[PDB]
Design an enzyme around this catalytic site. Structure first.
Site, PDB file in Angstrom:
ATOM      1  N   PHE A  86      -8.039  -6.813   3.587  1.00 21.90           N
ATOM      2  CA  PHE A  86      -7.550  -5.299   3.556  1.00 21.90           C
ATOM      3  C   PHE A  86      -7.941  -4.431   2.379  1.00 21.90           C
ATOM      4  O   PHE A  86      -8.169  -3.402   2.462  1.00 21.90           O
ATOM      5  CB  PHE A  86      -6.474  -5.259   4.238  1.00 21.90           C
ATOM      6  N   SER A 134     -10.847 -21.203  -5.218  1.00 20.45           N
ATOM      7  CA  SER A 134      -9.803 -20.773  -4.382  1.00 20.45           C
ATOM      8  C   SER A 134      -9.526 -21.079  -3.083  1.00 20.45           C
ATOM      9  O   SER A 134      -8.795 -21.458  -2.748  1.00 20.45           O
ATOM     10  CB  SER A 134      -9.393 -19.490  -4.897  1.00 20.45           C
ATOM     11  N   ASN A 147      -6.380 -20.143 -10.418  1.00 22.30           N
ATOM     12  CA  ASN A 147      -7.631 -19.387 -10.249  1.00 22.30           C
ATOM     13  C   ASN A 147      -7.524 -18.104  -9.902  1.00 22.30           C
ATOM     14  O   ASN A 147      -8.150 -17.180 -10.421  1.00 22.30           O
ATOM     15  CB  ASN A 147      -8.782 -20.219  -9.459  1.00 22.30           C
ATOM     16  N   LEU A 193      -8.665   4.061   2.474  1.00 21.63           N
ATOM     17  CA  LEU A 193      -9.684   4.819   1.773  1.00 21.63           C
ATOM     18  C   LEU A 193     -10.667   5.809   2.436  1.00 21.63           C
ATOM     19  O   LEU A 193     -10.940   5.226   3.769  1.00 21.63           O
ATOM     20  CB  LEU A 193     -10.566   3.610   1.132  1.00 21.63           C
ATOM     21  N   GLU A 203       0.950  -1.319  -0.054  1.00 20.59           N
ATOM     22  CA  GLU A 203       0.165   0.152  -0.120  1.00 20.59           C
ATOM     23  C   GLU A 203       0.889   1.281   0.037  1.00 20.59           C
ATOM     24  O   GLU A 203       0.229   2.287  -0.624  1.00 20.59           O
ATOM     25  CB  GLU A 203      -0.785  -0.115   1.142  1.00 20.59           C
ATOM     26  N   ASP A 226      -6.277   6.920  -5.771  1.00 25.16           N
ATOM     27  CA  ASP A 226      -6.147   5.314  -5.880  1.00 25.16           C
ATOM     28  C   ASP A 226      -6.046   4.895  -7.324  1.00 25.16           C
ATOM     29  O   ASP A 226      -6.156   5.700  -8.351  1.00 25.16           O
ATOM     30  CB  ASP A 226      -7.408   4.726  -5.134  1.00 25.16           C
TER      31      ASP A 226
END
Ligand SMILES: CC(C)CCC[C@@H](C)[C@H]1CC[C@H]2[C@@H]3CC=C4C[C@@H](O)CC[C@]4(C)[C@H]3CC[C@]12C
Ligand SMILES: CCCCCCCC/C=C\CCCCCCCC(=O)OC[C@H](O)CO
Ligand SMILES: CCCCCCCC/C=C\CCCCCCCC(=O)OC[C@H](O)CO
Ligand SMILES: CCCCCCCC/C=C\CCCCCCCC(=O)OC[C@H](O)CO
Ligand SMILES: CCCCCCCC/C=C\CCCCCCCC(=O)O
Ligand SMILES: CCCCCCCC/C=C\CCCCCCCC(=O)O
Ligand SMILES: CC(C)NC[C@H](O)COc1cccc2ccccc12
Length: 442
Positions: free
Chosen positions: A305, A318, A333, A233, A212, A221
């Site tokens: 997250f 998955s 996948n 965010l 991040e 973003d």
């Protein structure tokens, strides 16, 4: 030939200039810039001083000895030049050994990247390194404990035009072990542990700071949303005032779009906590979290997250493969999704972590870890340059005929060029890059 002498002179002159101007720039950058005044940079100053003394008082007199094929500086400067040469090599490897030990005590402490020594204690260590290495270099040479007893050596000592390094087999073994081999074996063993501890002590907090990033100003973003700090965010709405409103309320202060390092860390510790909380609430994510190990549990929190509790739950196939400990089949996948197409570099790191169950993907990504790799290159290059000389030096003691004079001087000069490589390796650190361009007025 004449062309070989002129050509050699030009090359040797450029090597001297690169070592002198290079190490002058390093010392000046630390002495003037406040941020470059650290315990680790104090040991780098000790290393740069030895390389500068090498390029001003050792390499110039050695270059003249090759081009003229004789010694025109007397028997006093010969023994003094040899004493400085040894002192420079002995102090450099012992300084590199101290860095390895200091970086070990720092990585194994709760401070993690701060030296447990003060700026006053480090100054004493550097002074002790030079005093002790000054005694083991000058005394065995000035007292003539090094001198060989064969006729070819005795004649060279008497002659004012001969300065060829002839040593007794006892000095050649004793001085090589204490000056070079002892700190080298310690430095290699201790710094291999520093790289091990760093990879092993990686957590979810260090993991997300890599993916991040850290920005104290409201940025945009990859999906055009308002974000601040470590992937926090603010809003989906294209309003800077509403983004500032969500920020001013969450902290409960007059932010004005800018936050501090202590404030960003406070928000991050809450977002990671909420990401773990969401998994235990979800009935589809909870049994997958339990079947995963410590490293792979961090890889799942990383997904929650980023995409959210509801988002990750959408990977029904998955999640089933992860629960059955089938890593490579789950990996195919996860690659076939909009997540992999949006953030490919980040998804590649998380998917590889699910495959291996190690921190191999986050290898030297952190800024503090990149500083450990930079110091590791300095120690590695120094070993690569001086090892062929010291190995051939020990082989000459066993059998005298195998090594020629022209081979000895060539291997000694590979070690000499190393005094000009260190300033180029400091260009890896952004702190030195900004300092070098300021002093060169670029
Ligand atoms: C060729 C011989 C005679 C010269 C040897 C030079 C000696 C005096 C130099 C080489 C390295 C130097 C040190 C390099 C780093 C520092 C850190 C700084 O915060 C205080 C001074 C201090 C501790 C220096 C003191 C002087 C020093 C020990
Ligand atoms: C000839 C000797 C030249 C070497 C003299 C350089 C030693 C001084 C030095 O490197 O200065 C460190 C500075 O004080 C860090 O803050
Ligand atoms: C042997 C090499 C020893 C080199 C000396 C380095 C000392 C050191 O790094 O300090 C230890 C610790 O930080 C202090 O609590
Ligand atoms: C060619 C470039 C290498 C020459 C580099 C010479 C080193 C000079 C460094 C310098 O510019 O000095 C700044 C001065 O001390 C003000 O603070
Ligand atoms: C002959 C010796 C030549 C050069 C070595 C001295 C380096 C001069 C740079 C010092 C000035 C400065 O700090 O900016
Ligand atoms: C890397 C090595 C860089 C330069 C080597 C220059 C030293 C010249 C040694 C030649 C050997 C000799 O003729 O005695
Ligand atoms: C030609 C000579 C003066 N150069 C010396 C080397 O560059 C430094 O090598 C050396 C450094 C330290 C100890 C040593 C012991 C024996 C032989 C060489 C040693």
């Amino acid at each position: 030939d004449e062309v070989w002498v002129v050509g050699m002179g030009i090359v040797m002159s450029l090597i001297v200039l690169a070592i002198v101007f290079g190490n002058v720039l390093v010392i000046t950058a630390i002495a003037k810039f406040e941020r470059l005044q650290t315990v680790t940079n104090y040991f780098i100053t000790s290393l740069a001083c030895a390389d500068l003394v090498m390029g001003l008082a050792v390499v110039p007199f050695g270059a003249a000895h090759i081009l003229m094929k004789m010694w025109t500086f007397g028997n006093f400067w010969c023994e003094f030049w040899t004493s400085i040469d040894v002192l420079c090599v002995t102090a450099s490897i012992w300084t590199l050994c101290v860095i390895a030990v200091d970086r070990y005590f720092a990585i194994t402490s709760p401070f993690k990247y701060q030296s447990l020594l003060t700026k006053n204690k480090a100054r004493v260590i550097i002074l002790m390194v030079w005093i002790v290495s000054g005694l083991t270099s000058f005394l065995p040479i000035q007292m003539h404990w090094y001198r060989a007893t064969h006729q070819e050596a005795i004649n060279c000592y008497a002659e004012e035009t001969c300065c060829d390094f002839f040593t007794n087999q006892a000095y050649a073994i004793a001085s090589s072990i204490v000056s070079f081999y002892v700190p080298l074996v310690i430095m290699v063993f201790v710094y291999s542990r520093v790289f091990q501890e760093a990879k092993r002590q990686l957590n979810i907090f260090e993991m997300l700071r890599i993916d991040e990033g850290l920005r104290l100003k409201i940025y945009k973003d990859t999906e055009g949303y308002y974000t601040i700090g470590i992937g926090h965010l603010l809003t989906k709405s294209p309003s800077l005032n509403a983004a500032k409103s969500e920020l001013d309320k969450a902290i409960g202060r007059n932010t004005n779009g800018v936050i501090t390092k202590d404030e960003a860390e406070k928000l991050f510790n809450q977002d990671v906590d909420a990401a773990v909380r969401g998994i235990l609430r979800n009935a589809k994510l909870k049994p997958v979290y339990d079947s995963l190990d410590a490293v792979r549990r961090a890889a799942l929190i990383n997904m929650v997250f980023q995409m959210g509790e509801t988002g990750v739950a959408g990977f029904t196939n998955s999640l089933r493969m992860l629960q059955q400990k089938r890593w490579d089949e789950a990996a195919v996948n996860l690659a076939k999704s909009r997540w992999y197409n949006q953030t490919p570099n980040r998804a590649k790191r998380v998917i590889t972590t699910f495959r291996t169950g190690t921190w191999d993907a986050y290898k030297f990504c952190l800024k503090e870890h990149k500083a450990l790799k930079t110091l590791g290159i300095i120690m590695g290059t120094f070993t690569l340059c001086w090892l062929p000389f010291f190995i051939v030096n020990i082989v000459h003691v066993i059998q005298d005929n195998l090594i020629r004079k022209e081979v000895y001087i060539l291997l000694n000069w590979i070690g000499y060029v190393n005094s000009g490589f260190n300033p180029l390796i400091y260009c890896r650190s952004p702190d030195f890059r900004i300092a070098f361009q300021e002093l060169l007025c670029l």
